[PDB]
Each structure stands twice: as C-alpha cells, then as structure tokens.
Symmetry: C3
C-alpha cells in the first residue's frame, strides 16, 4: 500500500485526558496510525485552494477613444471651454495654438484651445487579494482502505471534530505551515492566465486603473500631439508589453474563482485517551537515483525527486545540506520526515536551501547524491 505511519515521538498519552498527536500533512502525502485491535487510520490532505478573492485594483491595458470634440478661440477670446472638463470619462488637453487668417481669425497671435475624447477601456487586467475568507484546506480522515470523511478547514475556523467509528470523537486542529504571504502577493489575471506577483510591483505598473465607472491617469495611454489651426495618439494592446514584463513571475493554474495550491498543513488530533502505535523507520542504505531534476516551488522551497534502489522499504531517508563554505546546517528540510514506503514510488523532498551555492546530499555512505543548487533573493 501507500500511507506513512507516525513515529514514537509525536503523540502523547496522558494517564487522564487524552491522546494528542502531532501531524504535518503535506501536499501529496498521507499519514497513518492505529492502536490494538482497532482498525487503521489514514489522514490525508485533500487539497488547498483559494476561492472568490477581492478585486484590489483593476487596470486598463488597452482602451479606445470616442466622441472626440474640441473648442478653440482666437486671441482676445479667452480660454476655450467644454462641459466635458468635468466628466472623468474624457481625457482632455488644453494647449495654446496659433491663429492667423489661416483659419478665419482676423488678428495674429496665439489662441486658447481645448480638446476631449471619451476614454473607454476594452481590455482590463485584475490584481486580486487573498484573506482568510478565501482560504480552505480539504482534509480526509479515512479509517486496503475504505469509506473516508472530509473535513474542510480554514484560517478562520481551523477546529473540526469528527465522529470516527471504532475510535470515537476526534478533533482536528490545523494550521498552514509552508506557504505564501498573501499579505505581499497579489493574484494577477490577464485574459486566460493567472500570475502571482509582489503587491508593490503590481501597484506600480504604468497604466490607467480603478479601485476594484472611472479610470485614472487615463492619459498614460492617450495623448495629444501638435494641435493644428488637435489630435490624440495612443499606444497599442498591452498583452505583449506585459507578457515580457511578467517574465520572472510565478505562473498559476486557476479556474474561474477557484485557484489551487500545493498546501502544507500542520495539525494535532485530540482523541479519547488511547495507546496508539508508533513506528520508527530504519535509516536507509540503498542509494538514490535522481528521478527528475531539482525544481523550485511556488511556496518557496526546492523539490527534489529521488528514487531508492535498495531492499529496505520502509526506511528514513538520510539527507544533508551544506552552504558555500561547506558547513552542515542541520535543518532546511521542509519535508519533515521523508521515508521510503516502497521502492518504485519515487519520493519527494522539499527543502529550503540557503542563499548562494548550496550542496544537498541525499543518501548514506558512498553513492549518495550530491546536488549543487543556486539561490539569490529579490522582488
């Protein structure tokens, strides 16, 4: 089978009270356990996603101009005028121009002259934000395998109890572990794609915008050139200007209002006072083949997918970091407890390597993998 049991160290049983157990369910891993003559337990992180996010600031990449009107005056005729100077639907430019007999204007000199046009945006991109009323983890408690119940847990209401047969009441109690600062990050949506970019950056892009109907610095796209006895220019469709600008950007698969994420959660189960069964896996001695190259993740860590070539399943996977210097730093491992359930199922490791030149080591003895990695750290 498929799921990983709990070690000896991560649950307590009080003479009285109950059995409190720690758990870090991760994106793509299930955790397991049982007591005597009680059926097995399976705890799995169904998925993490955010739905229905606020609209933070709508931006016009590409707009058209309508109903264009001027009024100019001769000299000694004062400033040209137009009611439209009040409506924030028109950009309008007031310049001064030259009138001669060259335009029905008796005298020489320079004549006031203003000119407007309706500004109408046609392609808008959206910057959105995520609060607690948008996050939800879906979480499986399943009791060979069978029926399973689905707890759904949130930032606002992270306590679920659950009535498991053979085991009785069980409260879950969860909190995200390894992720994103939606306090710094906006979700960006241009037509069919969603990127994910640092707020400040987002808020600083040269364009007409609107508080998530009335545009702002419309002029950024619509301009006026040399007036004659005026004409208004404009830059094109922005799709392209951007795509080149969103270049470094974490990309995301989204659908409508839902958006899915690779979630780490971290819970503690509280259930009636029970002697569970710990397991403490034997440390591995086969060697590890790299399956597929070391990728960055979008919750900030670095995934590496190994493949175990020995007769050990199951076992703890010996792993190790050094920095440029060469120093073992004893940490930097997201995937707290990375164990070979069964060969043939390559195994993931999520680690947060240090800045600069990092040396990851997987495996015991010779034939251990030694990856270089590189890190460098801006917006």
């Amino acid at each position: 089978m498929r799921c990983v049991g709990i070690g000896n160290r991560d649950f307590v049983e009080g003479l009285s009270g109950a059995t409190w157990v720690d758990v870090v369910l991760e994106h793509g891993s299930c955790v397991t356990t049982m007591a005597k003559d009680k059926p097995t337990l399976d705890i799995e992180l169904l998925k993490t996603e955010v739905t229905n996010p606020a609209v933070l600031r709508k931006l016009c990449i590409e707009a058209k101009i309508s109903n264009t009107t001027t009024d100019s005056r001769c000299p000694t005729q004062g400033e040209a005028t137009l009611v439209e100077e009040q409506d924030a639907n028109f950009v309008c430019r007031r310049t001064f121009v030259d009138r001669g007999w060259g335009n029905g204007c008796g005298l020489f000199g320079k004549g006031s002259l203003l000119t407007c046009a309706k500004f109408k945006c046609v392609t808008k991109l959206e910057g959105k934000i995520v609060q607690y009323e948008n996050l939800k983890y879906s979480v499986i408690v399943t009791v060979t395998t069978e029926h399973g119940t689905i707890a759904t847990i949130t930032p606002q209401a992270p306590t679920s109890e659950i009535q498991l047969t053979d085991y009785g009441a069980l409260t879950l109690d969860c909190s995200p572990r390894t992720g994103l600062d939606f306090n710094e990050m906006v979700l960006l949506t241009m037509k069919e794609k969603s990127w994910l970019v640092h707020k400040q950056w987002f808020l600083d892009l040269p364009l007409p915008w609107t508080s998530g109907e009335t545009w702002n610095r419309q002029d950024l796209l619509v301009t006026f050139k040399t007036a004659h006895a005026q004409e208004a220019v404009v830059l094109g469709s922005q799709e392209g200007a951007m795509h080149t600008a969103l270049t470094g950007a974490t990309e995301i698969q989204t659908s409508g209002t839902t958006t899915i994420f690779a979630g780490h959660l971290k819970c503690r189960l509280k259930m009636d006072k029970l002697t569970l069964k710990g397991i403490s896996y034997v440390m591995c001695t086969g060697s590890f083949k790299l399956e597929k190259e070391v990728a960055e993740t979008q919750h900030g860590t670095v995934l590496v997918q190994v493949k175990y070539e020995g007769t050990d399943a199951p076992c703890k996977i010996p792993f190790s970091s050094q920095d440029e210097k060469g120093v073992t730093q004893n940490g930097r491992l997201v995937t707290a407890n990375p164990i070979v359930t069964d060969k043939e199922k390559p195994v993931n490791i999520e680690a947060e390597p240090p800045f600069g030149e990092s040396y990851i080591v997987v495996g015991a003895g010779e034939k251990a993998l030694k990856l270089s990695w590189f890190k460098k750290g801006s917006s």
Copy 2:
C-alpha cells in the same frame, strides 16, 4: 449557574511534568473545570480591545482659503511671480491671460499671470493602524463564584502565570484565533464615528492628505477658474460625500483611543501535574427556535442565536452545513463546542459559511432548523 466545563479530550496529564489543557475562550463565553476536592475553576475572556493606534494618514475633507494674492504681467514682461510659490501652504495657479487697453496695458497680447492662496484645512479625517503594541486581551481566572484574578495578555507577551490557591502556579498561554487582519484594515475616524476599511481603498480616496504642517494635492479641493484682466473655487464640506461612500463599511463603537472588539482567544494552561475532571455532554434532542435573525460578524463569521426547547441541559448542540450543491462540509464552525448550559439562555453559534448559497442546519431529527444564507466576496 453559567459556565461550561472541559471535555475529555482537551487536556493531558503526564506521569511526570504536568497538566496541559487546551482552551478556546470566546467573546461572551466562560470555560470551567476542577479536580477532586479542589474548588471549581472559571476562565473567562474579559475583553478585547485596541488602544492608542498609530496615525497612518490624515486627510482633509474640508478646508478654507486665506490671504489670496496675485501678480500678473503684460506681454514682454515675462512670467508673473510670487515668493509664495515656495511655501506649501498656498495653492497657486499660473495661467496666461489677455491684456488690452482693457486693464492698463499698452499693447495687445497674452500676459503671464500667477495667483495664490493659503490653504487651511478645517475638518480632517484620520486613518489609523493597529500593531502589537496596541492589542490587549483581558482575561479572568476565577476559582456560586468568588474572587477572580485578571490576566492581561497581548500579542507581544502572551504568557501569564498566576498564583491560584488550592491549585498552585498556573501559566496561561494565549493567542487570538478568529479575527481581523489589521495588516489589511485601517481604522477610520470622521468626527464622532469610527469605521473600519480596507487599507488600499482608504489610501485611494481623492483628497488632500499628510503623513500622520503640510497638505498634499491640496488642489483636489481648491481650483482656479477663468482669470480676468483670477478666482479660485472649492467643493464643500465632505461629511456627506463620504457617509454615502463609507456605505458597505463595518461600523465600530470607539471611545477616545480605546476601541473594543468581540475577541476570540485560544490558550493552553500549564499547571502542576493534576487529574482534572472532563465532562462530555450528551448530544441534544429538543429542537431549536431561532431567537434573533442570522447576523454577520465583524470578525468575518456568521452568528446565529438559537433557543433550546427540551429537558436536556446540558447537551452538545448538533449542527451542520451544506453548500449550494448540498454537500455536508464538516467544519465551518467557529464556536468550537456549542452546548446548552441551561434552557432560557439562548445560545450563540458562530459559523463561517461558504461562498454562495449555504444551508445551515441546527438540531437532530425533524424539527431541526434549516437556514439559507448568502455569501459574495470583495473589498
């Protein structure tokens, strides 16, 4: 009496060490317990409030103009000038105007001409922000009832120990549970009222402002119109323009610098090694009358106040959510553990319902309440 005891699952007692107990005190509920021949225990959340918040950005809704001065020139007399063009106490507009014999000006043509006025705001509204040095929970430990001690716990210093007679030392250890992102929300104050609005929104309101003395884009209120051989206009008192704009806004009762909130906290008591008494209430079978209609809360959840019509007190209150689809999602309940202490005391439920059309169910069997609710999610 009045207070709710602890279940069997939420405290442990180690052979050695001590007795660690979980607790979620909520706005408007007390939690209770005791051991053998030891007097009872009462833990109550005195109140949550924030005091003395930073001033983030002072905005002028309504200002007056003073000491208004111009200087214009004829043609061939160069640009008009005024020292005041340096002081950011005056808005000043430089235009060009027409001089004839119509104003003591020998020749025809257009003459430079500038004009100023002291800008003096008279009604300011304030946007404030909340950090850790502003939050405080007040919390009661009381040991029929008697004397009680008041722990006061903060974001910065959430550990209080406390010397209880009959029970000995007891450390509390607390953290907010269900609330507000003061990282996204500003406290807004216009004259006598305090609203509570999303930062970005706030920062985007068309008005003169100042970093919490020198105004900025003063012009937003003060304008100049057609100059004559100039005059400066201005929009009125803003109270009203706003009140219509703060429309969706969560309103708040405030007093001076204090501001009070409905707080959820979540602690763990650490006290010397003790066999406490759990209670695990019987699940309710009376039916529930809705007392007062389902209100939104300002910490984001949805309160519903029920009333129990059966001979059961005490008992657990069977409750249940479905989404539009119809699916039981097993969670979404803020008021972790909602129990009938005694009839006649209607009971609250705080739940965080999903987006769209939600079906809450309270009660076991027929005669269970089934509310519809609606949700939709922007700034």
Copy 3:
C-alpha cells in the same frame, strides 16, 4: 555555571508516545535540563538574523544633470520640439517665452520653447523588505559543558531533528515570539547606515524613485526657472536633509546583506518517552539594585537590568506592573521566567509596559525597586 533549568509545569511525559517539553529561548539566555544518569542538556539561541532582502524601492537623494539641450520657436512657428521628450532619461520643461528683435525674431509675441537634460542620480538610498526566505534562527543544542550541535531554523522550515547521544532522536519545533512586523517595516539603507522605518512613511518621501534604468518624478530635484530669449535648478545632496528626518528611527547594526536581531524564539522538543527533571526556583528575597537604566528595545519591549544582592541563587524574581491608575496588571512580562542563576551576573527583564505612566516593581517586600516609565504610540 551559567544556564537555567526547566520548571515542573512545562513538559509532559505520556504513558506512551513521548516527552514534549515547552521552551522559550530568548536573545541572551540558555535553557537547561536532564533525566536520571543522563548527561545534562543545554539549549541556546545562537542568533537571529535576516539575510539577502528584496529591494523594494530605490530612491535618488542626489543626482546630476547632463547634456542639456533646448529648442525654442518664434510666434507662428508652433511648438518647439525634441526627440528627447520620449526618453525617460531627461527631465524637460515646455514653457512659452517672449521673442522680440531681442533675439533674432522679426515679430513681437510669445514663442513656444522646450528644454531638456539627462537626469543621472549619483547617491541612491534603498528601502528593502523581509520575507520568510530571509529569516533564520541559529540554535544550539549542547549535551562544565562540551560539544554542541547547531540547528538552524526558519519561518519556512521550523522543524529540526537532531541526534543526541545518551538522549536519542530529538525534534525541535520553533516559532518566533516577540518581534517585528516586517509586513509594516522596511529596512532602510543610506550609505553606511541602516535604519528601520514604517513602510508607509518610507513610501511617501518626496523624491525621484524606481521599482527595485528609469527614475520617477525626477523633477522633485530638478527644476526650471524663468526662461530667457531656459535654466534648470536643483536642490543639494540629501544625506543631511534625511538624517534630520530619520530622527525618531530605530537604528540597526548591519553588514552587507546580513542583519542581526535580538531574537525571541519559542519551541517544543519532542523526544523519546522520558522522565525529565523539573526545578521550581525559590522566590527571591534579596533586594535588587538597578544596574543600567531602563532602555527601550527594538522588538518593542522595555529592558531593565537588575542586580541581586542576596544569598539565594537560584531564585524566581518577583516582579510587578501597575498602570497610571495604579492597577496591578498580571502580565506585560516578556521574559517569561526571570531567575537569579548566580549573583554577580546581572539579570535582564524584558517587559511590555502599558501606554501612559507605568509603574514597574521588582522585588519582594520593602527595598523593592519601583520604576516609573512613559509610553505614547505613533508612526
């Protein structure tokens, strides 16, 4: 020796499972423990620091102007022009001027005239931001004293296990306790110094800037004055203008990209099922001399350094707060558990006093210290 053991209340031992122990390691204090015939344990907070922070917004305090070019026209010659009006490397001002025979210009009147110059900043100051990929605590587990292992723990990956001889596996599990909202605070760097200021403030300083190469509102420094038959002014080096502005600012020692902080952490050790040894120190009766005056800290608390004059070592240090009113508030103490290890080693206390006039009390009976303190709370 030097390190402080664990009390009776802060670790549990389950019949089965293991030994979970609470710990708040603080900047400048080590925590200690052991079981029977097992060697002693030392847990010490190596240090907290942030490295390699994003660049949030680069600001030009002081720039120079280059390659300055105009083109003006006579009347009936239309607007002056220059290709450079497109390049955001030049600030350029278009005015109107006067042409007579005073400059080779046949007729009287006012003539269009524009003028540019390359804007080149020469001193830039930087505003930076801190996310999880920048924080790291270094933490010592040492087992008279000996060899010690250094766990390094982060916001993203706060779980380290560690193989201690005599004690076996031990997982640490940590989270900052008392600190800074890098969500509100920017790290500021002008030449050789680093300050630390509230984001909004930072984002609001009058100057050319750039998203962490193209300046913005260059004009803030570079101006044009009365054109002749034009000339461009500029304010000076900003070092000084600022230093007076960064006045209230928390100052910081930094080096390159590293920046060090006084860290509080808060962990829980999880190790195989063990009867540890608690100690519960006797409450002190000597009196306390103030060693060095009560300083503010930059994680927001107030440090006070006492000195114990009695034959008690070791003992708990009786301490107590009142507000202006006079009320004992039972909390406000950061240094959860402040104990006299040995006289001659003055002792720190970190406390978060209330707003207004605060009365701290250290010591039992007469000869107890009673400090006044003052608090007041903006940006």
